[PDB]
Design a protein around this nucleic acid. Structure first.
Lengths: 190, 181
DNA sequence: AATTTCACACCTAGGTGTGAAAT
DNA sequence: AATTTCACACCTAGGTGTGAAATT
């Protein structure tokens, strides 16, 4: 367990977290912003690794945004859990030297509210809080089967990456930051 | 017992009849048409490596004569370019994975820069090349098969010589739609 | 020269939030 | 109501040939 992970764009994640991060969710699938990007350290260069991402609920409560007080409040009890989906990195599996070579970005990752989705996108319930988790798994390609044991995986949880899944932005301050930092939203600047 | 089917065969043969030309730039240029294949007779449990390589057709330099609208031998071929091993991005993969859908080499770029380090194929302008496709059976400790489609042979150029080639590239490549009509 | 390189307009492809409309 | 979906304009990103200019 000597593998180290460094979250890229930490300052941007913390700026969003202070406001209370919101992530748009659609039927077709929406990319996260900011993109979850990491730097890998202490891996064996000859060993083959699988890089994974999963989303875990923060609490069992449904949220509501009050525009009068500009804050999030508990609306009621959480809706039933969404069918569990996982997202492997497109380059997985790959050698330890390949992962440590450059920053690993989960830019192809998409969030959806469609419970019946078959496009490999992450299914999330709108107005609920989620915690993105990052997993490094050691895998032997000569073996046709894979499973989880205590010594074959490591989980990395960055508290600043937690967000609320929404269909439209609630906090206007979040929209302002998304517009100002995401290049695809440059047409809305000024 | 492995069988390979060249996709877009009709488009390749139409280009070959005119004498296929591929643009070559410093930055790297995609081939048009894209080399796409269908795999058959592979073992679904066996691991395979899929490769692409370019071999010179002859040891001659070519020149296009606009008066007669034909290719002629200009002189002797330039020295061979620095060759490297080119694997499909998904290689290695199981036999069932390769046979599942059409295999394409769309991210494949041709360059005339001898000092290139971006993993692109280095070629000499005004020379005839033959693209070859390889299927290699991964063994823990013959397995090497080569598929050569004669219709995929082309002349590497910096600018199109035959106006008929340009016309076909414009008419069939979606990125050249702005030049239609 | 005869051949090669450059900025450029114009495509494809797909990622943005907007504000109306819909549920 | 409070929340979700739709067409849309406007971006980024990157693949085209064009015609001018340049070039061991």
């Amino acid at each position: 367990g000597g593998v180290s992970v460094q979250l890229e764009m930490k300052a941007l994640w913390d700026e969003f977290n202070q406001l209370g991060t919101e992530m748009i969710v659609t039927k077709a699938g929406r990319r996260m912003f900011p993109t979850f990007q990491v730097k890998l350290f202490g891996m064996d260069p000859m060993a083959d690794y699988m890089l994974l991402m999963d989303f875990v609920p923060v609490d069992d409560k449904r949220y509501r945004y009050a525009f009068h007080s500009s804050s999030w409040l508990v609306a009621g009890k959480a809706d039933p859990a969404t069918p569990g989906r996982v997202h492997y990195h497109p380059d997985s599996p790959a050698k330890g030297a390949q992962w440590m070579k450059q920053i690993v970005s989960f830019d192809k990752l998409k969030l959806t509210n469609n419970l019946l989705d078959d496009n490999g996108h992450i299914i999330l319930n709108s107005m609920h809080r989620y915690q993105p988790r990052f997993h490094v798994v050691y895998v032997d390609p000569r073996k046709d089967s894979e499973k989880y044991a205590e010594e074959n995986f490591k989980t990395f949880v960055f508290e600043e990456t937690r967000f609320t899944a929404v269909t439209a932005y609630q906090n206007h301050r979040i929209t302002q930051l998304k517009i100002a930092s995401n290049p695809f939203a440059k047409g809305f600047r000024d």
